[PDB]
């Protein structure tokens, strides 16, 4: 099972990771059997 | 093929289904049988399995 | 060739009745037989394809039988909306899609 | 639900020609075969033409071999017949039936029909 969990908050930090607690709800489940070891992000 | 032609000569539309089971999440099933909610009352409930 | 026949041509009954009409092949027709309501002010409609076969959406007072060379359609109850001539059709010799004449069918 | 309407009808001398549309929107026509219909002012029913789902199989009734040719097209979802060499005897009315299976001379029958179109050959105004 592939699992995401999303969260949107906004902050005014610019260069650094901000200092807080929010937690992620789940998004979607899909149930589809991947061996999976590899990934990489896309670019606009 | 042909009208004419006998009972053993006729077409025949065949279609077979193949069932597999495998390593994987189960993703075709029966529909679900559901029933009418009873309140206030001692009953036995299937939510959702 | 072949030849398609009509027995009756015009009949009467009333509101709670019951009506068959009859259609004869010169040959063999090997229960391909269809039988259509055309009516005098529309276009005409099918109601039953092959030989005792009823179409999906039309009531089943309609019920035909038969097999061979003579066939039959009986009516059960003769609502009032069911006034219109039917034609049987032979969808199985080399003729292709031959008619036989009308039937009338009035109620009094 | 299908929707089946003609055009084209209307009075010529004999020995002209006209033309016959009709346009299908009801249904998926690019699989299933069509005829035409002759119905006579005072007489029944009678088999004309047919084409099946894609032009390879067409047939004439025997009294309009070589005067009628029946075409279609795919893309528009409507069908056409040519009438060629009309004389005094095709003053009927026609319809533009729906063949049940994808062939032409098949056991099958029609499914859906529409509104006759009146044609009338004859010499006035
Ligand atoms: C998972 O898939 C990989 C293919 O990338 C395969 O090498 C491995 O044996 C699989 N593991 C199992 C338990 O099937």
């Known amino acids: 099972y592939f699992k995401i969990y999303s969260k949107h908050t906004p902050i005014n930090l610019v260069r650094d990771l901000p200092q807080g607690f929010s937690a992620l709800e789940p998004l979607v489940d899909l149930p589809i059997g991947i061996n999976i070891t590899r990934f990489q992000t896309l670019l606009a | 093929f042909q009208p004419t032609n006998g009972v053993g000569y006729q077409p025949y539309r065949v279609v077979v289904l193949s069932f597999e089971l495998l390593h994987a999440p189960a993703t075709v099933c029966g529909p679900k049988k559901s029933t009418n909610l009873v309140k206030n009352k001692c009953v036995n409930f299937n939510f959702n399995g | 060739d072949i030849q398609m026949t009509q027995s009756p041509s015009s009949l009467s009954a009333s509101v709670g009745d019951r009506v068959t009409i009859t259609c004869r092949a010169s040959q063999s027709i090997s229960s391909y037989l269809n039988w259509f309501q055309h009516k005098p002010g529309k276009a005409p409609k099918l109601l039953i394809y092959?030989?005792?076969s009823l179409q999906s959406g039309v009531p089943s007072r309609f019920s035909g039988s038969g097999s061979g060379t003579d066939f039959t359609l009986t009516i059960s109850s003769l609502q009032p909306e069911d006034f219109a001539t039917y034609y049987c059709?032979?969808?199985?010799?080399?003729?292709?899609?031959?008619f036989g004449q009308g039937t009338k069918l009035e109620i009094k | 639900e299908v929707q089946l309407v003609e055009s084209g009808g209307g009075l010529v001398q004999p020995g002209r020609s006209l033309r016959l549309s009709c346009a299908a929107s009801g249904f998926t026509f690019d699989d299933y075969a069509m005829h035409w219909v002759r119905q006579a002012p005072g007489k029944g029913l009678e088999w004309v033409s047919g084409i099946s789902w894609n032009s390879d199989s067409i047939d004439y009734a025997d009294s309009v071999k070589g005067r009628f040719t029946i075409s279609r097209d795919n893309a528009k979802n409507s069908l056409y017949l040519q009438m060629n060499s009309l004389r005094a005897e095709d003053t009927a009315l026609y319809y533009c039936?729906?063949?049940?299976?994808?062939?032409?001379?098949?056991?099958?029958?029609?499914?859906?029909w529409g509104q006759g179109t009146l044609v009338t050959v004859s010499s006035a105004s």
């Open positions: 059709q032979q969808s199985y010799s080399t003729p292709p899609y031959t």
């Open positions: 039936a729906k063949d049940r299976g994808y062939e032409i001379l098949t056991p099958a029958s029609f499914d859906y």
């Open positions: 092959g030989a005792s």
